[PDB]
Homo-oligomer: 121 residues x 3
């Protein structure tokens, strides 16, 4: 499951390092995808370049997760809980402010190694 | 509805400030989501880091909007019109160059407060 | 089909220029969308701001492609192959490390020129 993440700006590397590290380790820990399938990208966002509720500058994370369809409401429900857990622990933010977004892609619609669709595996 | 936005780079803050402000106010004004549900993130893009039609460096906006499924073609159709309106007014761009992308997420597939899926509310 | 792209950081412009140029030319070359419909945005990502497999700093690309639904598994399958081809040729990376993500949007859910949904055309 490749992941892209927006966090409110202003963290040390190891925050935005260890977070990606146990984000990977939690993406394995969240069934399927050994390792080579997962990636995670962090892209910090400036205050006065974001708004939570209606207050510009409000700390935030949104995870968009692209996974290969065929997975269960409850394993997905499990991703969400452990990944909010990790984001909280190692990004030093609130549980409430992480918006994850689980996007299940079909094997013919993900272009992977060699540009052969994921289906062709 | 959390929002992520790519605009061609080169604006003053208040442009890329007031735009987010009435983008929020228009996201309320566009039925459902009181406030705490909405967020908006702006991420400006350099010329020669984007292309509209086939001409590198061409002013542009693309809004990706993540909303909770269950909403109507016409309220969505309403988002699009007022949000192109706002993007135009306060980002100082053309109507034609904003590409919005309405993505309706299911309540079990959005991880929100506490990492409990949105369904569990 | 508007495109957003994350590449591992560290390329010259013309890499991240010509890539967008034949990415456009290949998006035409991949049936439908004359030109004014396509856009492509590149957003480079720092090492220690990304992870492929579980190794922070690993060169990578992910293309998210937003296209208007109604297109065939095999033309999409064609996008993937030529666009991995182009990404490889002109971004100087491996075939295996590009993750594309084909997202087919419905004509009423894409807000385009004038903020009139794409359906209304």
């Amino acid at each position: 499951p490749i992941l892209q993440v927006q966090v409110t700006a202003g963290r040390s590397q190891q925050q935005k390092t260890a977070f990606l590290q146990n984000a990977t380790k939690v993406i394995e820990q969240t069934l399927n995808a050994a390792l080579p399938s997962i990636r995670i990208s962090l892209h910090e966002i400036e205050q006065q370049d974001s708004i939570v509720a209606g207050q510009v500058g409000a700390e935030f994370v949104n995870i968009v997760a692209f996974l290969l369809a065929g997975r269960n409401d409850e394993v997905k429900a499990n991703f969400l809980a452990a990944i909010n857990k990790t984001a909280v622990t190692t990004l030093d933010v609130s549980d409430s402010c992480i918006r994850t977004m689980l996007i299940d892609i079909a094997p013919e619609h993900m272009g992977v190694q060699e540009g052969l669709s994921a289906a062709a595996f």
